[model samples]
Target chain A: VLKVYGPHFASPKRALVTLIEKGVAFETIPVDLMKGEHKQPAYLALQPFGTVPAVVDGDYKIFESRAVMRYVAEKYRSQGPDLLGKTVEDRGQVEQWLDVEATTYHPPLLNLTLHIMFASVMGFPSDEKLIKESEEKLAGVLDVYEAHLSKSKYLAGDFVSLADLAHLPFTDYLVGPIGKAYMIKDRKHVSAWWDDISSRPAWKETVAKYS
Target chain B: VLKVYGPHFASPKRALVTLIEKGVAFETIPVDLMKGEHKQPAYLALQPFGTVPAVVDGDYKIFESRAVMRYVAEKYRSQGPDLLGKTVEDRGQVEQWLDVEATTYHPPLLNLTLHIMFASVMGFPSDEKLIKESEEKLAGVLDVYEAHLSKSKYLAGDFVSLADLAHLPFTDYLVGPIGKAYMIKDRKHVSAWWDDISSRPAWKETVAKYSF
Candidate 1:
């Protein structure tokens, strides 16, 4: 059994979606970020950086949501939808898309999400200029996604991979009222791609359980 | 033959190091960033983001240096030192450390490198406040690396992996004239780890060839 510790927020949801998609048996133990519990000594022992979500499988412990997702997908490779991809070339494409999600896609969307939703909630003023820049950056990124999805069914290829699943947590916020929902909805192929992936039974289950 | 386009800059160097380490034959086509060539229609046709170090292997074109590294490493796994790792568990650890390098180590180091070195060359004023903050952040990150490297010889395990090699480009800048090489030199295990990695034949070749 895998033990995952973190709330179903942005980062942890990356792991959660993978777990659900892979049909892995795991437990979600909440670490209250609002209460500063994640920064406590006990939590820090598992995650040196005091971030979430951290996963413990028997004797092994791993942090970083992408790493956690990779671990589960690789460990449970035989049991699921082959999230990493089947061949060397396919795997390379999968990894390429995953890196794009990490390096290119996430940063601006994350900044936009934090500024719009969390800044005021956390008692800080939002920077409208930064928010606008983030929005524009995100739209530009989605334009690429639009073109890619028009050609390939998913980020990696025809089959759904971790690259597609990795988008759930943030794209959830992107489609919510707090985010620039139209940025996704306005793009034809991107919107259709989002609808297809979001409608997956595994994704739907994960969303209902966590979100 | 593989065709790699980009300058010998930080990000492209990541792909170059992987190619050399894998003993892959490739040609480096320079994209003149100063001339804004990377943003031109021809270059952007291959890499939409106008980024450096896009690789073409036969018909396969890939951008993002780390992903390119992964592609070269995995495709040439048998020809190289198994940079990913030997076992399932080891591969997981390797991926873990690679992610740590990307998400944690690179950002602050990149910021410091740009501020300390590229700011003036690129005709921008350096922000002392941002530089200082980046220094503090990088030091804190290296503190964690110090502890981890003390236990293991490399980031993932006893051997060199993509995790360690991913540090080459930016950390090169980090240990250069503009960077506080002492930040790495000051940490015992990190310094030792750096010594081990920097001493590799492939790395030495990369540095000597590109530094000119």
Candidate 2:
């Protein structure tokens, strides 16, 4: 069986959801960050950067959540919903917003999570100023998403690509656990798009079983 | 002919370089960020976020440098050098490092450039603390790249994929105009990789004709 090595409750959820979305069976091999298990030789051998969400299939090893989702989506593309999109143009839009999510959307959101959610979860000190800054940054990115979502059904298009799927984990934390539901709820189209994608059975199953 | 709308010296350089590398002909429609031309309605219609490096091919519009590169690479997959790679596994490696480039590598380098290079060019205020912090962040990322490059010839693999090409635009600024040559020259494999990719006629052609 294929293996996913990462914390269940973190970026690993993207890999888990992607597998479920693809109808692929994968076993979770949790790597504990608190214990420094990720930095140890055994794990670092698989993921050189020591980041989480490293996937192992047979003898092959791959890391990075976006890359992992892409590999899974591409490998099982025939069986799954076409997450990459149909046309090269469709794919361009898919990758465009995915890149936007990674570069623009995820960074400030991750920073806000570090300050707000991770502080409670991991016993880290939270700073209100930093939290405010990230909030402002994220607010701007979401405004852009609001405008785009108003036009398109999803970030990429009518079909939900890995672009939308990649937002599953952190966004789940943002709207639910982090107590920032208003961030999504405040915007019209973004809120509706959130409702649409978050209600998917694949995501629910992944969160229920894996996390 | 397809049109790429953005400043030559900025992120749009990636689109131009990708077009050249793929042997695709393109016309450069300059968007002046200094003059707020990109924020104008006409440009915003093509690029919603008003970010540089938007592409137009037969009225199909796409933005984001990585996506633009991928689209060009995929659309011309047969004609070009196969930047995405031949296998699904190969593509995983390509997108992996490309993601790393966008998230980890570019952010701090961008901050550093904002402080050092762009301040001089764009008349922005430069702060020493932020510059030092971003320098430290980028240094750490380069160390990781050093380790990875030690193993593989290129960031993604032995072949020079879009993964390698993506690093070209900003790196040219880093090593050249930004005068942060040591950022790349400091590393053994990254330096060699930079030399290899930067020397390509495709990149040289793009830089020569597009940039001043």
Candidate 3:
């Protein structure tokens, strides 16, 4: 069976949802980030950087979540809803939004999470300004998303393509421990869009399995 | 004729060489980054980021050097000499290296360049520690490249591919204005590899017309 070796995190969750969205049966092999299992010698052989979520397809291995997702989409294109997008234009738009997510969103979310979780995980208290500044930057990006997503059903468009799938985990940061103060609670378009994405049965299964 | 816009920097150099390597005749339109041309309304409409090396092919437009190269490779996939790599594995390696280039190499190099060059270019004092730290970080990554190239002809393997091409312009920074202090000449493998990639006719054309 296809084995995904990673801890429970945003990127890994995205990968899990991709597999779920494809209805692909897979096994999860947990790597303890707290204990630095990813840096252990054996795991380093598979991935030099030792970052999760790396995938081992029996023998073939790939790192980078986007690479894994793109490969999965390409491999199982006929089986599921085409996630990368339906056409070249859709593909380009999907790519654009993905880039936007990476550039605009991931940094601040990760910046906050790193200071908030990493220091605590490493046996230290969280720094408030670091967390606050990170939150503020993330809030700025979220405001932009609220504007964009309010105008469309999904991140790229009306379809639930990879662009939408790619963002599901980030939304969790706000809605989960971080709280949803930054979300477009007042924006009807973004509100309904998140509802549609969050309500997917596949995502439900993923949440059950991981969260 | 085709109109290409970019500053004479790493990103634009990549596009320029790709165009020349394709033997596609095009007109050069230099965007004076020193004068804030990239952020002007004209270029911003083409590339929202106000970044240099924006390409315009009729009505279509693209930013990000890797993405631009992807478009170029796809458009010229059947033409001479594939920079995207020769196989599926090679393509994956290329993509991986592109990520490495962006996430790892470009950050340090761009940071160092900005602090060292741009501060002065913009009439501000260059931060010494920033350039020093950036150079050290860049060297660390270059050492990894040295180890990898010791086994293969290029980054992807056994051929001059996108992995190698993407790095040329940044390596140029060391030889150009970073002032040979950080030159790869001492790194045997990277030096030799740079020599080979630097000698390409396409690369030379980029160098000759380069005004910065």
Candidate 4:
């Protein structure tokens, strides 16, 4: 059985959803933050950076959620829906949007969660200024996303690939816990895309894993 | 002929470096940020976001430097030095570090350049607090990197994969014009890795494309 460790207060959605999609059986081990166990000996050995969710398959271990996602997805490529695209050109589109999601979409999401949600939950002083700044930046990013989604059925094209799946956690946080549904709801295709992806049975299974 | 358009104020390192490694010939076209030509009709049509290093290969066009890097790298995968990796597990390690760079290492670099380097040049007000914060975060990030590099020769083990190559530009900015050499020099392995990758002929060729 594969072992999945977590700093699980926040969503480690990618790896979890992927495991379900790939039909991989795994056990979850959350690195507890109540007494700050994530930085403790064994967990740190697994992921030196002390992030999550780290995964172990036999003796080999990995961290960085995207890396874990890629490993499982590619390793079990024939089993799942093929998160990577159908063609060379198609995969380019997949990669393009993935990079965009990572570099562009995520920074604001990070800040928003850091200040708006995590700050309050973790009892750190929240910055209204930073929160506002991030929300505006995210708005501009979604504007570009909205325009693109109007042209293509999914970020990569008609196929629902990893590019779309990757957005789950942050979008869940934004529309649900973070109270920023308007960001998605206001955008026509982006909202519809969120509805389609989030409604997947694999994703529902993922939600239960965390909940 | 591949037409590479650039915002050019910053390094579009990944795409340019990949083109060289793949031995792909291409011409440079700066989007002329001086008059804000990057947002003009033709360039904007090519890259709606108006970001740097958009490339055209025949009828197909791509933007987002990493995307272009992947497209060209995979397109010319057989011809190149094989930047991805040799095995299935090997590529997983490559993808791991690549994501770490994009998600963790890059945000601070973006902040520092935006506040420290770009603010004065672009006539925008700089944030001293943000500069200091970014620098500190980056320092902590390198601490993790130094530990990782101590074990492996390159980021994804023995091979010089895209994982290590992906770090070129921001490191260039930090060590060069951004005036933060000590960040690398202080970390023995990171400094050596920088010396190794930055000294590649492809990187030297990339530097020549933006001597400004």
- Best DockQ goes to which candidate? 2
Off by over 4 Å in 3: A86-90, A123-160, A180-199, B32-37, B120-136, B180-183
lDDT (10s digit) by residue, model 1, range B1-212? 89888647778888888899999998888888878999899998898888888888897888888888888899999997999898778888888888888888888888887777778763556588888998899898999899888889999898899999999878878888664899999999999999888888888888887764
State TM-scores per candidate: 0.96, 0.95, 0.83, 0.94
Model 3's A-chain: what TM-score? 0.91
Instruction: Order the numbered candidates by TM-score, best leading.
Output: 1, 2, 4, 3
Q: What is the C-alpha lDDT of each candidate?
A: 0.86, 0.85, 0.72, 0.82
Report the lDDT tens digits of candidate 4 across residue range B147-200.
888998899888887777779987888998889999999999988888999999
Residue B187 displacement (Å), model 2: 1.8
Top TM-score hit: 1
Candidate 1, residue A26: Cα displacement in angstroms equals: 0.6
* Candidate 2 lDDT over residue span B1-212, tens digit each: 79888647567887788889899977878788879998999998888777797888897888899889888999999986889989999998999988888888888888866767678763546578887898888888888888888889888887988888888888887897778899889899888878889999999888888777
Looking at every candidate separately, what fraction of the true A–B Cα contacts under 8 Å does it contain? 0.61, 0.90, 0.00, 0.76
| Candidate with more favorable, higher TM-score: 1 or 3 | 1
Evaluate residue A128 in candidate 2 and report its C-alpha lDDT on the 0 to 100 scale: 89
Model 4: CA > 4 A from native? A7-11, B7-11, B121-125
**Per-residue accuracy of model 3 over A40-143 as CA lDDT, tens digit each:** 88887666566777788776776667656766776677787888667654565565566555555676777666666567667767778877788777666666
Q: Per-prediction count of colliding residue pairs?
A: 0, 0, 1, 0
Docking class of 3: acceptable
TM-score evaluated only on chain B, model 4: 0.93
Worst lDDT 10-window in candidate 1 chain A: A172-181
Model 2 docking tier (incorrect/acceptable/medium/high): high
How good is the docking of model 4, by CAPRI class?
A: medium
